[PDB]
């Protein structure tokens, strides 16, 4: 919450009390909490009436330090899943001189929720089979579409993991988030076409065109019609078998049963084989683009920019050769529909390729492999989000897809909503230049720089992994999609129990708002202890200060117990800084060591390797200091139930008292080194007895003093020196300049932020790369009013927002269970 | 205290309740109370870390009447003991075209705390002496360094006064305050080199050079090496005798015993004869200068200004011929060390004079007189404040010097910290011009103009006395420094019991802050009744209005009872306006009528003769009206525990209500004379029934109406006319202009005061020279919003400071009893 006076800066919760464990069961963060503040929609659903195109930013009055009120001053929503591979430089479109930002997961099978053979599986073994041991009979007890010698080779030795529908449901959770950009124009913001390319105005009118393999720079049309995989040059292979006898002799264990519940006479019914073959194989199969008509700032040069979404750059899968076994009607003996296959058509795209598809091959003979990047390229303009929604409802009737899609969905939001770093400026609204690394350099919500590609596409290098995600194995999928095994995370449901995000037009708006509390929780994690940006980068193996290696060691997921993931320590600190600070729990998955079942969130599955949230200067130079700051503060304050005390709104100037500090009555002291000219704030009592941290000590979490340090570097002329006033190794901003948010184009009657209002002031540097303590200093002449404001005998004029705090309770309808519809109050006893 | 809202303007204490008698014992005003607000030092002692050079002014935010906030706007500390005898005119140094400001005391012996012969004195009489009346023996019962016929002529008829160590301890309290300007550069402010010469920047680096008899203008090098006294051309005479038999036949009663406790093998031990001969004789012996390297505003013309401190212009003593009797070792009969004198050396300065000292004469023969202005000129570069401190500790071991030095020290502060008058301007920060009487015209803290010299130096005119101070007689000093008499103010002590100001580098900073509550108490005395400046000047003998003669008659110390000072009436009003308003008592001395012992402060020992605190206009013209206003208001408000209601901060504009007034519900009425155009505020009910005061009536103390009169002359267009709107004899400021504080040079990021913020608004004129009442008027058109603000139906936009009230409790350590030092916790039972 933002502050009305100093008596609620002072009576704000601490960090240690707000990072404690919580035993409450909390509702999921739906993204509607930020929505019902920054838009005209407070109540309920609105089809096309609510113009979300214009409602894309934080708006409010501001109050300057000089006593003036700015009327309509805006802060951008700082997250988008769209990297502009065509940049508007000099009011005209040119190709990007920048590589594409790629991520990579760490897909591996772990001990999920345990699995058990059903009464059908004990029925096949006990009866039938066991009874063929006396009758000399080799009859067929065919289950629904498969041979008895196909079920008999699967009702066998079961792996003791249990499956997690996570990788296939992130691919479904991911192509959904791509294919939901072409829904309308007044349902997708214009700010999220302007987050990186800020010299750009997209248009109401023509919607976005979600294309595939048509990006104009650095390869990236990975076979525009001769398609390969983007990660690794190769085309894969798919084969549609009717028996396991046809799978040649080599694979036969990798063979995936397509269950007959996902293909019924309810849809196109042959697109569902492509969503199944796309969920089970590999992401990405192709490099999707989003092309939209844009215009420059005044509006002359209307062209079409090419974007590439971030979730088409996430390398997940490792299954490139699929052998799919198809249900054979009711019951038939083993044999162009040889054995009564319902279908296997190619698609809708003509696809002149290496096997030369013509326009749409209908073919399910015995072996006869196709390519897989080709077979998925043909079904790349057909995957609209309504079809994905009803496919999810057909999945939900046989397995439990409610909680696993929401965990996979905020996994998508965790590694897909990606934000440009910062720019250091004095006032408000600085950005970068065009055709430069600094405009396109970009970070996660975890304050962690996204790796861009090193060489031209399709890639042979395979960069380091970023996140540990699970996967469906084919061998357990073949028996849980067939009634032969069951678990507690796999209990089936109805299509009403599909989450609200699926098949809705408002996903590109909601998913960029779900990523803001992730960066608030990581932002408050990285700012309680200020280790700049250099003592985070080369911190994993520094032989100085064993404390710092323990910090970076524990933050990441590098431990195990039995064959399963032990989640990270200190990512539960971020999770508790999410549940306490937002009163809403993030979605976990299950992992079991043995018996004991414990929970791991995207807060606990990151991996080491990679630099952190850097800040740039006005001329593009690196200012690796402060702390890993991303989005501007007011996001890390206003949209918050309980923000810890060191991060706080400087309260408005009401009477004679505006902004004060914390003095030696709270256990603090002034540093006051060698020279008489520069003095430091009221830091801790340990600050004068250190000067360099001991090899197992770090910055003590004091929010009286971190407040009191950002209270001094808001003055506008500070230097970040030393215990003795000497320089540091770290790059310092050129003046009294702070990291400030990204500037987007304005509208009519709508202003830019004024002075340290769209800034990030909380990033107080306290721990240099060398292990020495960083002190913020002022001249003796220019520190009298800050020292007396700490002593409550003066006041400091600071700028603020003129908003008020509401923070409503959760709705739990979210446009996803509108079961009030009159035709099921009467079909209600039958459920 | 400054006001948060109007409900604490209204609920402020009155004048009559705040001038009442108080029975509390209060702590002394140490000067640390102003310090712990206007500087970075709140806690404790700081050797050279704390740069007091830059921490020399009141700093804070301001709020204009137009709703704007000024960030760092400064008010100067308006007191210094340094008159610039070299003025920087046109960025370059020239000699002053102005005479030197001189004061003069009224040294006389009064009935102090009574004195009584000890057991040693009754031992000399009863035994020895009385027993020589039977034995025909003329033996020597020598006490410590003197003959028995030297003690026998002093153990005699004792005067019934008792001595007061006041004149010698003001001379010691005075040369200390001169010789503490050469301690450092970052321990003395730069504002106090800029109080009169405001076109000047002194430098960190080279310290001040405390010279002697080297001033370049109007004589003032009173014998640069042939030295005379500055007050009266003459050189004096000193003689170092060993017996009273050598003192020729003429003086012999004026002969001063030098006690052997001030000269021990602990120091130079011969400088203490010069501090003794300087305490006992005459002030000043020479005209000390303080030369410091200064630079102009931008910084080009680095030169050295010559200053003369105010306490080297205070004429105290009347003893020009000293005959000092020296202790003769243990025991020896009467006789270049003839009779075992320890020493009598000349000094360190070569001193080509009328007796022609060469460099350092060591000489104690029998009579052989030296000059005294010569003997003290040689010990004029050696009196550093550490030696003065240990000399004070050697005095404190034999007599009680704790309370008498503090009374003599705030006597020094009372008649040494001296401030330039005012300049009338509309906004903030007006000063005077260079090489003009008006820049150098200057006042006490008692709102009383300092007399400058009439003719060239050494002076034969001897101006009128300013203050009644006591003195040590030699005849009682010869027996209280010898064990023959004792009193209650003379009980001996330890060197730990020497006050904290002695020998510390921070005296020039602390003494200018001790003088601010003196001028607050006198400022609130002179403003409760507004008698302008003309009915104070020629008010002592005006045959009109017997009330006014009683005011000026009683304010000054012109009464007696028995042979001792009766202190002034109405200076106890100022003393009670000090103890009630500051919760800290000023240091008294003792005077006894007989039996009854009563107390007289520098508040009760001033003398008539002399003009009062005039105000100048922008062009230098005299504006003798208002009331004797000196320092700007915020000093007479913020640094205050309980400021009476007529002086009050106009509260800040918070909501719709900012500043209101007092109407006929509080017993007031509007004057409303002959013409319909000009109307006056809500004055008293007596204001319309007077028009001229009766010959025994004066302005009734009403703080509802004095507030309401400064509430109208803050508007910016008033005239001070009459009962009928006619002019007055007094000089009126040229427009709606008020007396405003002195402008000093600014620093980086540091502003000037804006509009009536560094002003003195409390000086409401209410009593003309003619005995007629002065009314403040507005036009009928421009008085509707003030009248309705009095009726609480409107608001007035006034400017204010954005500070807050703290006013801490006294410390009582003050860097003067750091007895916690580990080597006397173990030597603690032995004290």
Q: Which residue is closest to B650 within chain A, CA to CA?
A: A656
CB contact under 8 A, A785 and B186: no
User: A778: number of CA atoms within 13 Å, CB side?
Assistant: 26
Which residues of chain B make contact with A679, given a CB cutoff of 8 A?
40
Distance CA B823, CA B803 (A): 44
Q: Which residue is closest to B747 within chain A, CA to CA?
A: A781
Contact A605, A734 (CB under 8 A): no
Beta bridge partners, B585, equal B28
Long-range contacts of A434-437 (CB under 8 A, 24+ apart): A434/A87, A434/A88, A434/A89, A434/A90, A434/A199, A435/A87, A435/A89, A435/A94, A435/A96, A435/A97, A435/A98, A436/A97, A436/A98, A436/A620, A437/A98
Please list the alpha-helical segments (H only) found in A652-741. Answer: 703-710
CB contact under 8 A, A796 and B61: yes
Tokens (6 digits) for B606? 């001033």
**DSSP tag of B724:** S
Q: Which residue is closest to A787 within chain B, CA to CA?
A: B40
Interface of A with B in 759-798 (CB under 8 A): 779-785, 787-788, 791-797
Contact B405, B498 (CB under 8 A): yes
Beta bridge partners, A778, equal A679
Q: What are the CA-CA distances from residue A797 to residues A650, A803, B512, B705, B758 (Å)?
A: 9, 18, 30, 35, 20
Report how many Cβ contacts below 8 Å link chain A to chain B: 111
User: CB-based contact (8 Å) between B803 and chain A?
Assistant: yes
Give the number of other CB atoms < 10 A from CB of residue B788. 16
Distance CA A17, CA A754 (A): 34
Interface of B with A in 38-57 (CB under 8 A): 38-40, 42-43, 46, 48-51, 54-55
Tokens (6 digits) for B340? 């075992």
Give the number of other CB atoms < 10 A from CB of residue B165. 26
Handedness of CA B130, B135, B138, B142 (dihedral sign): negative
Per DSSP, the three-state class of B778 is strand
Place of tokens 């779900």: A514
Distance CA B350, CA B357 (A): 6
Q: Resolution of this entry in Å?
A: 3.2
Beta bridge partners, B669, equal B683
CB contact under 8 A, A67 and B69: yes
Distance CA A230, CA A227 (A): 9
Q: DSSP of A301-335, one letter per residue?
A: --EEEEEE-GGGSEE-----EEEEE---SS-----
Minimal Cα–Cα distance from A786 to chain B, Å?
9
Beta bridge partners, B74, equal B59
Tokens (6 digits) for B584? 């800290």
Which residues of chain B make contact with A784, given a CB cutoff of 8 A?
38-40, 55, 59
Q: Which of B72, B750, B806 sits opposite A791 (nearest CB)?
A: B806
Distance CA A409, CA A311 (A): 12
CB contact under 8 A, A794 and B60: yes
Contact B423, B629 (CB under 8 A): no
Q: Count H helices, E strands: chain B?
A: 19, 32
Distance CA A776, CA A661 (A): 15
Q: Which residue is closest to A674 within chain B, CA to CA?
A: B49
**DSSP tag of A731:** P
Contact B693, B547 (CB under 8 A): yes
Distance CA B511, CA B406 (A): 12
**DSSP tag of B132:** G
Tokens (6 digits) for B35? 């310090």
Which residues of chain A make contact with B69, given a CB cutoff of 8 A?
65-67, 653, 797
CB contact under 8 A, A66 and B63: no
Q: What are the CA-CA distances from residue A677 to residues A674, B40, B55, B602 (Å)?
A: 9, 11, 11, 38
Which residues of chain B make contact with A673, given a CB cutoff of 8 A?
49
Write down the experimental method used for this entry.
cryo-EM
User: CB-based contact (8 Å) between B747 and chain A?
Assistant: yes
Distance CA A434, CA B627 (A): 68
User: CB-based contact (8 Å) between A676 and chain B?
Assistant: yes
Distance CA B178, CA B308 (A): 9
Tokens (6 digits) for A634? 């007011």
Contact A761, A627 (CB under 8 A): no
Element (H, E) at B437: helix B437-440
Contact A577, A16 (CB under 8 A): no
Q: DSSP of A546-579, one letter per residue?
A: HHHHHHHHHHS--EESSSSEEPPTTSHHHHHHHH
Burial of B283 (0-12, 13-18, 19+ CB in 10 A): buried
Tokens (6 digits) for A607? 């991996």
Give the number of other CB atoms < 10 A from CB of residue A759. 28
Element (H, E) at A519: helix A516-528
Give the number of other CB atoms < 10 A from CB of residue A204. 12
Q: Where does chain B break, by residue before each gap (C–N > 2.5 Å)?
A: 335
Radius of gyration of chain A (CA): 29
User: CB-based contact (8 Å) between B804 and chain A?
Assistant: yes
Place of tokens 């067939």: A482
- In terms of phi and psi (left: phi > 0; alpha: psi -120 to 50; beta: otherwise), the region of B89 is beta
Place of tokens 């200053």: B307
Place of tokens 């990660």: A231
Distance CA A602, CA A605 (A): 5
Minimal Cα–Cα distance from A13 to chain B, Å?
26
User: CB-based contact (8 Å) between A103 and chain B?
Assistant: no
Angle at A489 between CA A486 and CA A493, to 5 degrees: 85
Distance CA B314, CA B105 (A): 7
Name which of A174, A173, A211, A208 is nearest A188 in CA terms: A208
Give the number of other CB atoms < 10 A from CB of residue A236. 24
Give the number of other CB atoms < 10 A from CB of residue B531. 25
Name which of A704, A672, A691 is nearest A768 in CA terms: A691
Minimal Cα–Cα distance from A499 to chain B, Å?
49
User: A656: number of CA atoms within 13 Å, CB side?
Assistant: 25
CB contact under 8 A, A794 and B800: no
Distance CA B800, CA B753 (A): 10
Q: What is the 3-state secondary structure (H, E, C) of A140-174?
A: CCCCCCCCHHHHCCCCCCCCCCCCCCCHHHHHHHH
B86-89 and B92-95: which strand pairing? antiparallel
Per DSSP, the three-state class of A612 is strand
Give the number of other CB atoms < 10 A from CB of residue B390. 17
Please list the alpha-helical segments (H only) found in A54-141. Answer: 119-124
Query: What's the residue count for chain A?
Result: 831
Element (H, E) at B599: strand B597-600
Q: Which residue is closest to A677 within chain B, CA to CA?
A: B51
Contact A546, A695 (CB under 8 A): yes
For residue A103, how far is the Cα from the chain centroid?
11
Give the number of other CB atoms < 10 A from CB of residue B130. 10
Element (H, E) at B74: strand B69-76
Contact A75, A634 (CB under 8 A): yes
Per DSSP, the three-state class of B40 is coil
Identify each DSSP E strand in A471-554 by its residue range. Answer: 485-486
Tokens (6 digits) for A358? 């013509």
Distance CA A790, CA A663 (A): 5
Contact A548, A529 (CB under 8 A): no
Please list the alpha-helical segments (H only) found in B538-679. Answer: 546-555, 572-582, 635-638
Q: Which of B40, B69, B748 sits opposite A784 (nearest CB)?
A: B40
Tokens (6 digits) for B489? 């103010």
């Amino acid at each position: 919450p933002i502050s009305a006076d100093f008596s609620e800066v002072e009576n704000a919760p601490s960090f240690l009390s707000l990072a404690e464990n919580t035993d409450e069961v909390l509702k999921p963060y739906t993204g509607l909490e930020i929505q019902t503040i920054i838009t005209n929609i407070v109540g309920d659903a609105n089809p096309n009436q609510s113009r979300i195109f214009d409602q894309d930013r934080l708006r409010g009055n501001q109050y300057s330090a000089g006593g003036l009120v700015t009327q309509n001053a805006v802060s951008a929503i700082p997250f988008t899943n769209l990297i502009p591979r065509t940049i508007r430089v000099g009011n005209i479109l040119v190709n990007s001189a920048n590589r594409l930002q790629i991520t990579e997961t760490n897909v591996s099978e772990y001990y999920s929720n345990p699995i058990i053979a059903t009464k059908l599986s004990e029925m096949i073994s006990d009866q039938v089979k066991n009874n063929q041991f006396s009758t000399w009979r080799r009859d067929n007890t065919s289950l629904q579409g498969f041979n008895a010698f196909d079920i008999a080779t699967i009702n066998t030795a079961i792996l003791p993991n249990g499956l997690s529908l996570e990788s296939m449901l992130l691919k479904l959770s991911l192509l959904h988030s791509i294919k939901a950009m072409n829904v309308d124009a007044a349902s997708i913001n214009r700010s999220q076409y302007q987050v990186i390319d800020h010299n750009t105005v997209p248009t109401i009118g023509a919607p976005a065109v979600v294309g595939v393999n048509n990006s104009p720079v650095f390869g990236e049309d990975c076979g525009g019609n001769n398609p390969v995989y983007p990660f690794g040059g190769g085309t894969g292979a798919i084969a549609f078998h009717v028996t396991l006898q046809t799978v040649p002799d080599e694979r036969k264990s990798y063979a995936i049963f397509v269950p007959p519940a996902i293909l019924q006479a309810t849809s196109d019914a042959n697109e569902a084989l492509a969503l199944f073959a796309l969920s089970m194989s590999e992401w990405p199969h192709a490099l999707y683009t989003v092309t939209k008509q844009t215009t420059d700032l005044a509006g002359a040069n209307a062209g079409q920019q090419v974007f590439i979404p971030t979730q088409s750059t996430i390398h997940i899968g490792g299954r490139r050769v699929l052998d799919l076994i198809i249900p054979r009607r009711e019951i038939a003996p083993n044999p162009v529909r040889p054995q009564a296959g319902p279908d296997a058509t190619a698609g809708a795209i003509p696809l002149a390729a290496g096997q030369l598809f013509n326009m749409n091959f209908i073919g399910a003979p015995a072996f006869e492999e196709w390519p897989l990047t080709s077979y998925l390229y043909s079904w790349a303009g057909r995957f609209d989000i309504t079809t994905i929604r009803q496919y999810m409802g057909r999945l939900a009737t046989m397995v439990g897809v409610k909680d696993a899609y929401w965990a996979a969905h905020e996994l998508n939001v965790a590694l897909s909503q990606v934000a440009p770093k910062m720019t250091t400026a004095a006032g408000g609204w600085a950005a970068q230049a065009a055709n430069s690394a600094q405009q396109s350099d970009v970070c996660y919500s975890s304050l962690l720089t996204v790796t861009r590609s090193a060489a031209n596409f399709p890639l042979a290098n395979q960069p380091a992994a970023d996140m540990r995600v699970y996967d469906t194995d084919p061998a357990t999928w073949n028996k849980v999609a067939l009634g032969l095994a069951t678990a507690a995370n796999l209990v089936p449901e109805q299509s009403m129990d599909v989450p609200f995000v699926v098949g809705d037009a408002r996903t590109s708006f909601w998913e960029r708002l779900q990523a803001i509390p992730m960066c608030i929780a990581w932002t408050m994690y990285y700012h309680s202890r200020g280790i700049t940006t250099l003592a985070w980068d080369n911190a994993y193996t520094d032989n100085t200060n064993k404390w710092l290696q323990k910090m970076v060691r524990n933050t990441f997921s590098t431990t195990q117990s039995v064959g399963t993931i032990i989640p990270a320590r200190y990512g539960k600190i971020v999770c508790n800084l999410y549940k306490n600070m937002f009163h809403r729990a993030p979605a976990y998955v299950a992992t079991s060591v043995g018996g004991k079942e414990l929970h791991i969130t995207h807060f606990e599955r990151w991996l080491p390797g990679g630099t952190y949230a850097n800040v740039y200067s006005g001329a593009g130079a690196v200012v690796n200091c402060f702390s890993p700051v991303l989005i501007p503060d007011i996001w890390c304050q206003y949209f918050t139930a309980k923000l810890p005390l060191f991060a706080g709104a400087f309260p408005p100037a009401q009477g004679q008292n505006s902004t004060k500090g914390f003095n030696s009555k709270q256990g603090l002291m002034i540093h006051r080194n060698q020279n008489n000219n520069l003095v430091a704030p009221y830091l801790e009592k340990f600050a004068d007895n250190s000067s360099y941290f001991p090899v197992g000590q770090g910055p003590e979490i004091n929010d009286m003093a971190t407040w009191n340090g950002r209270l001094w570097m808001t003055t506008g002329n500070v230097q970040y020196l030393d215990y003795s006033g000497a320089a540091i190794v770290e790059a310092v901003p050129p003046a009294g300049e702070l990291p400030v948010g990204k500037q987007i184009p304005l509208l009519a009657g709508e202003n830019a932020p004024i002075e340290l209002t769209n800034a990030a002031t909380t990033c107080v540097p306290r721990y240099s790369n060398d292990g020495r303590r960083i002190f913020t200093y002022l001249t003796t002449a220019q520190s009298v009013i800050p020292v007396q404001a700490c002593n409550r005998a003066a006041n400091l004029a600071r700028s603020c927002w003129l908003l008020s705090n509401v923070y409503a309770e959760p709705a739990l309808q979210a446009l996803g269970d509108e079961v009030e519809d009159a035709f099921d109050t009467l079909t209600n006893s039958s459920f």
